[PDB]
Amino acid sequence: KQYIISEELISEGKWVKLEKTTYMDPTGKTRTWESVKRTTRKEQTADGVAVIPVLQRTLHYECIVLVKQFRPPMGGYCIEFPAGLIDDGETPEAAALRELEEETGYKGDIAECSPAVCMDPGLSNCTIHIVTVTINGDDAENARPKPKPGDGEFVEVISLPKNDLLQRLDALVAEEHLTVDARVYSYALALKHA
Amino acid sequence: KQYIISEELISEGKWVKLEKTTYMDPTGKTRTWESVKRTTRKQTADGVAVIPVLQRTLHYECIVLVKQFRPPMGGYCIEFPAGLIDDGETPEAAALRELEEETGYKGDIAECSPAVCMDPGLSNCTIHIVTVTINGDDAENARPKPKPGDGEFVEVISLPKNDLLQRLDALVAEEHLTVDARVYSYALALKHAN
Ligand SMILES: Cn1cc(C(N)=O)c([C@@H]2CCCNC2)n1
Ligand SMILES: [Cl-]
Ligand SMILES: [Mg+2]
Ligand SMILES: [Mg+2]
Ligand SMILES: [Mg+2]
Ligand SMILES: [Mg+2]
């Protein structure tokens, strides 16, 4: 029933733009929407990837590997799945493994890869693939993981047991000013609800 | 170590603005970031998203989701019931109201997250994730009456909690819908638990 009629630029930055979207509603009335988009998406199936990295080690409980970074939009530190934008020509899987190694030092193995999912669909067109990766923490390549950050990347690694994820995130929120990412919190809630 | 130095307004709409954020990197070099904010926050957070657990005896437990056309996406999305928090509203209250308006269900609060970030590399947007159970055997929920605001056009899709990720994938495959990142994350963790 509903479809896009027109998209008009309001403001284009180097990385992010604001558009006036005109669309058809299901009464048959025309309406507008203020919409955010990145300037960086080309042929990618999505803007980015986020990695759910399952650290596995004999006689350890499974951990979820997260990252803590300053996020200028938020004006503070956030705890998130490792994530980055997909380079032009790069597959989602390659992007996930690369970003995981850059941000955490770990060399993972692909488990599964989602379809493109929407980040905040009332605000933006931004999409990611959520890629689940296992990390064999018994491999000597994953013994001494060193983050390889790029220019302007400054990432701390935080590994938390899957079997207590939500409480451990709450204990970090209670101990410093920081925000947990919604996808991470969602994942931690479902682990409790199951 | 890192902190905001200043913001430069690029472009303000009615609903959304684009800023250029100047910040101190951890090495003492001054850096810039293009950031999006909503104009509507007072509030604990921008919005709520409701995880509604529909509980009917002798039936599978279901998660209640909404399908809506999203003008920034140019298509239909599958999401948790959700909306912005009114000035004066507590998140719990917003959650119960948004749930009722969007699905017709009347729910009881189970738990409420702290403010969590939606897309922290892009925006400052935050929500409370509010877990709510719906006693589906209760007379008030026998004929759930979804009460839209002006311009809202919401289908209700209840999916069994035990097969959630497979059922979401089936919808994407069959229907050209985008599933929400927090919905997908939650569905993933349901399968990953234990
Ligand atoms: C919103 N945003 C995304 C990017 C990016 N392309 O990684 C940026 C810039 C990149 C150049 C240095 N400062 C940050 N801003
Ligand atoms: Cl529950
Ligand atoms: Mg990143
Ligand atoms: Mg990166
Ligand atoms: Mg809504
Ligand atoms: Mg609503």
Swiss-Prot record, chain A:
Co-factor: note: Binds 3 Mg(2+) ions per subunit.
The Gene Ontology CC terms held by the record are: cytosol; extracellular exosome; nucleus
Quick one: effect of changing W15A?
Reduces affinity for substrate about 8-fold. Strongly reduced catalytic activity and strongly reduced affinity for substrate
Q: Which cofactor does it need?
A: Mg(2+)
Primary localisation category: nucleus
Residues at which substrate binds: W15, W33, E34, R38, R71, L85, D120
Q: What does this protein do?
A: Enzyme that can either act as an ADP-sugar pyrophosphatase in absence of diphosphate or catalyze the synthesis of ATP in presence of diphosphate. In absence of diphosphate, hydrolyzes with similar activities various modified nucleoside diphosphates such as ADP-ribose, ADP-mannose, ADP-glucose, 8-oxo-GDP and 8-oxo-dGDP. Can also hydrolyze other nucleotide sugars with low activity. In presence of diphosphate, mediates the synthesis of ATP in the nucleus by catalyzing the conversion of ADP-ribose to ATP and ribose 5-phosphate. Nuclear ATP synthesis takes place when dephosphorylated at Thr-32.
* Annotated protein name in UniProt: ADP-sugar pyrophosphatase
